[PDB]
Design a protein around this nucleic acid. Structure first.
Lengths: 56, 222
DNA sequence: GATCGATCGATAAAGTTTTTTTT
DNA sequence: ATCGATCGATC
């Protein structure tokens, strides 16, 4: 089995922009993979101070 | 031949070695085995098989019987199954003495929906022919196909190994990725489409060697 | 003339980062 | 530094 973490392109991945702008091969994604995940960041008042307490 | 799974029934021995190349001095030995028996793991044409297929040849639905036999798991799709066995039944070399030199080999292709056993059918064709090829993802290239100079580790000299298109002398060339293939290559297959040969322009030697070949193409959308 | 001993001469070494055109 | 070959001397 394979576990892959393809790092995105310059800056944040623009969610208003189209995907497959930082992924390289579409042929692996269409049927040669099964499921995807994502690690987006949104500025949140409540969660990030706990995340600040998570690291401090 | 080199490169197979093997089992040997060997005895045991050991030899001395000279340290300096020009004296009789010798002391860490080297062992080696001596084999007594080794094991890996025009056909003899009988007449009961010819009698058995003539029963099948008596059956008119052999086209439909070969339509259903090629798919042990594949969905029905009768149209693609026509030419595949037809290309496997690859004609003959109807060659004249003077003029012509035509050969009855043809070339089918397919493209369309991604991963519809596009590869496993090609794997299934690789089952049914014993002497064939199998393409790779940049295992062969423009200069990596034939026309070699390579400095081998045994003698550091020249070796001219044939490409896969010449290597299918008695098979069917199964080849893929015909929308991502580089345009340095995808220029010599027109010659084997037309003059059935490969012209080699290498520093070693010139040769117009032929290639008794037969091709199918498995493209991809964009 | 043949055999043995002594003296003199000859025999052993190893590689794999910068730089050019080119595709 | 060691081994082999050639030359000289002695039996």
């Amino acid at each position: 089995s394979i576990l892959a973490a393809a790092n995105p392109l310059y800056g944040r991945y623009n969610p208003r922009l189209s995907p497959l702008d930082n992924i390289n091969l579409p042929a692996a994604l269409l049927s040669r993979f099964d499921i995807l995940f994502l690690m987006l960041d949104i500025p949140s008042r409540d969660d990030d101070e706990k995340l600040a307490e998570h690291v401090t | 031949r080199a490169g197979d799974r093997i089992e040997v029934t060997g005895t045991f021995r050991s030899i001395p070695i000279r340290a300096n190349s020009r004296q009789r001095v010798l002391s860490l030995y080297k062992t080696y085995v001596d084999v007594v028996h080794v094991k890996k793991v025009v056909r003899q044409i009988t007449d009961q098989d010819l009698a058995k297929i003539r029963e099948v040849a008596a059956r008119e639905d052999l086209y439909s019987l070969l339509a259903r036999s090629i798919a042990p798991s594949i969905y029905e799709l009768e149209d693609v199954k026509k030419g595949i066995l037809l290309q496997l039944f690859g004609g003959t070399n109807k060659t004249f003495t003077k003029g012509g030199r035509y050969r009855g080999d043809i070339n089918i292709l397919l493209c369309g929906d991604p991963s519809t056993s596009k590869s496993q059918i090609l794997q299934y064709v690789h089952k049914i022919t014993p002497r064939g090829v199998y393409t790779s993802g940049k295992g062969s290239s423009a200069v990596g196909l034939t026309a070699y100079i390579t400095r081998d580790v045994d003698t550091k000299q020249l070796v001219l190994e044939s490409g896969a298109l010449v290597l299918s002398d008695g098979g069917v060339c199964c080849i893929d990725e015909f929308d991502k293939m580089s345009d340095s290559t995808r220029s010599v297959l027109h010659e084997v489409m037309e003059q059935q040969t490969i012209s080699i322009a290498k520093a070693g030697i010139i040769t117009t060697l032929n290639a008794r070949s037969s091709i199918l193409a498995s493209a991809n959308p964009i």
